[PDB]
Design a protein around this nucleic acid. Structure first.
Ligand SMILES: [Zn+2]
Ligand SMILES: [Zn+2]
Length: 205
DNA sequence: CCATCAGTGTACTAGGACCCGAAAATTGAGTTACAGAAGTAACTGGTATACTCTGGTTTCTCTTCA
């Protein structure tokens, strides 16, 4: 919605990089899940025609654009004259952009999404008229879902690297086939591996 | 009747070559130096496969002693 703050769209973009759980759970897979990456790395920024609207709303937020502006303040790199902003003092109605031109939305460190303002139109009477739901999803992609590599009946909850049982190197397992292949009777890892929790992108996105 | 179990009708991948254009880089001529290395362009021996009388040979009647 025009005249609707930025960070009203940043908080709406469903990306699975917000739901990834950190750390490795090989020794014991019953650990209290570390906070999803939505909570740990709260920083993000839009880039709209030479101005990094940074999400400095929270204290855990740090300037992701500082890296780029420093990297460009060095040796000339094509780019030049980068700006900054705060993304809570801005609405889409205050923004000076091109249509159909790719801009940036970086979040979770370097999960980059290419933003394209396809068109701008005055609101009609036959579309949604609310605001409580308006940065709303017109279309999404319906990605594929990874499955457990042992039995192809359930989706992958775990991804293991350097597994001394897996044929493939990154091997995805459901919970059942993971518990059954790597753990003797009480949680002592059998063999060697690095198991991480796997958020299926084709499910939470 | 609620279990199960191929097919199906598709956008969504997965390899798998392959192409289209752009931008950067080179090539090319022009000069004038510089030293040295390629790069043909030229006359001038040197030793073998035919080769041409020729020196010897060979019966074959004869020459010359004996
Ligand atoms: Zn993302
Ligand atoms: Zn499984």
């Amino acid at each position: 919605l025009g005249s609707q703050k930025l960070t009203q769209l940043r908080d709406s973009i469903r990306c699975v990089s917000d739901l990834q759980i950190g750390g490795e759970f090989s020794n014991t897979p019953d650990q209290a899940p570390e906070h999803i990456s939505k909570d740990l790395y709260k920083s993000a920024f839009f880039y709209f025609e030479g101005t990094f609207y940074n999400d400095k709303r929270y204290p855990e937020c740090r300037d992701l654009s500082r890296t780029i502006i420093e990297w460009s303040e060095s040796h000339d790199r094509g780019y030049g004259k980068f700006q900054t902003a705060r993304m809570e003092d801005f609405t889409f109605n205050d923004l000076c952009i091109k249509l159909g031109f790719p801009y940036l939305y970086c979040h979770q460190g370097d999960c980059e999404h290419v933003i394209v303002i396809t068109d701008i139109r005055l609101v009609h009477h036959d579309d949604c008229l609310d605001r409580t739901l308006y940065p709303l999803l017109i279309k999404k992609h319906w990605l594929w879902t990874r499955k457990c590599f042992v039995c192809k009946m359930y989706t992958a909850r775990w991804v293991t690297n350097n597994d001394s049982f897996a044929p493939e190197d990154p091997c995805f397992f459901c919970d059942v086939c993971f518990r059954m292949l790597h753990y003797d009777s009480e949680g002592n890892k059998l063999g060697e591996f690095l198991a991480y929790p796997y958020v299926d992108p084709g499910t939470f996105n």
